[PDB]
Amino acid sequence: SSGLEVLFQGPHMDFDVKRKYFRQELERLDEGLRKEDMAVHVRRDHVFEDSYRELHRKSPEEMKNRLYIVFEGEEGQDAGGLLREWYMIISREMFNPMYALFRTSPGDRVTYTINPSNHLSYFKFVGRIVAKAVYDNRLLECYFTRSFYKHILGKSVRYTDMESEDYHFYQGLVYLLENDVSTLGYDLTFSTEVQEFGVAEVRDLKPNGANILVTEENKKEYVHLVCQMRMTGAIRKQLAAFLEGFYEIIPKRLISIFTEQELELLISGLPTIDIDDLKSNTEYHKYQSNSIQIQWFWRALRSFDQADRAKFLQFVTGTSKVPLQGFAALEGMNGIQKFQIHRDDRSTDRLPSAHTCFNQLDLPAYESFEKLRHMLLLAIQE
């Protein structure tokens, strides 16, 4: 053991305080390090490849130098804001299909995951860049899936994390787990070769290691293995490369102070959330605009601080990214889907819940403003 940052995990410490501590610990770890400026020469139209050439071989120590960006052949242009410009470009390039490194997650066009389909060196370099941005206190306009942030944090990925990767697939796992397989009219199998579910043929009902029959007793374990393959196994070498690059700059023990939600805010920034714009673009179901719990909801959200407002956006939409055109342009699967609040008629003992595929908040009919505010904060900060 080489640190105690883990003792500050969880919600007791506000994101702003965690952030300040995180910065101070990086500075402690760099005491006596004699930094200097390091030139990065790139062609404007090849930032990603040129940056890779210029930096991928640098030592972790050299990567702590201040980067001095020089755009090939561009002379007499103002020199302010070039590093910021470079981070914005490489953020876009770090998601370009032509490099085949990342791809959008099923359903959510905002969030990216590692492409399961040279390459390992580039993944390591991307991990380096993400850590370098965080180290520099500069933002990347790159959003990842929940399980990807957990990987960075050293946290165990669970089948519930599949709700961020792929909502429709998660629905299938939910159906499987909640219903007795013996009443299907057919049998499921688990393939040991690809770690996916299938339908048993007669020969699978006989002894074999190719397709294991799924039962009430074993389905939870196979749901676990199917999820582990999709979120970890299928991208195991790439992930390891990315992580190796990230940790060379930001130690695992240090970054682990943040939750999955807070790591996203650290990488891609704390957005400003225009509550009037959101409110003008909210739909209500089984509540009306003037239902008392709705008036309480707006008052509570407005009472939240910047970090908690952003975590609220993450809670209901799946990401902290505000749409370019404002909340009138929030999207679901197949087009626009405005933020929507539904009355949850189950016990007022429950926390509000969310269905991010539909930007939907399920809000119990709480009995007081203070309870609503308290319950919503719990739901969000989890």
Swiss-Prot record:
List of catalytic residues: C357 (glycyl thioester intermediate)
Modified positions (Phosphotyrosine) in chain numbering: Y287
Tissues where this protein is expressed: Weakly expressed in heart, brain and placenta but not in other tissues. Expressed in a number of cell lines, predominantly in those from colorectal carcinomas.
Post-translational modification: Phosphorylated on tyrosine; phosphorylation is probably required for its ability to inhibit TP53 transactivation.
Subcellular location: Cytoplasm; Nucleus; Mitochondrion
TM region(s), chain numbering: none
Domain of life, per lineage: Eukaryota
Quaternary organization: Interacts with isoform p14ARF of CDKN2A which strongly inhibits HUWE1 ubiquitin ligase activity. Interacts with MYCN, POLB and CDC6. Interacts with isoform 2 of PA2G4. Interacts with NR1D1. Interacts with AMBRA1. Interacts with HAPSTR1. Interacts with HAPSTR2. In hepatocytes, interacts with PAQR3; the interaction promotes PPARA poylubiquitination and STUB1-mediated degradation.
Family: Belongs to the UPL family. TOM1/PTR1 subfamily.
Protein name: E3 ubiquitin-protein ligase HUWE1
Organism: Homo sapiens
Parent-record interval covered: 3993 to 4366 of 4374
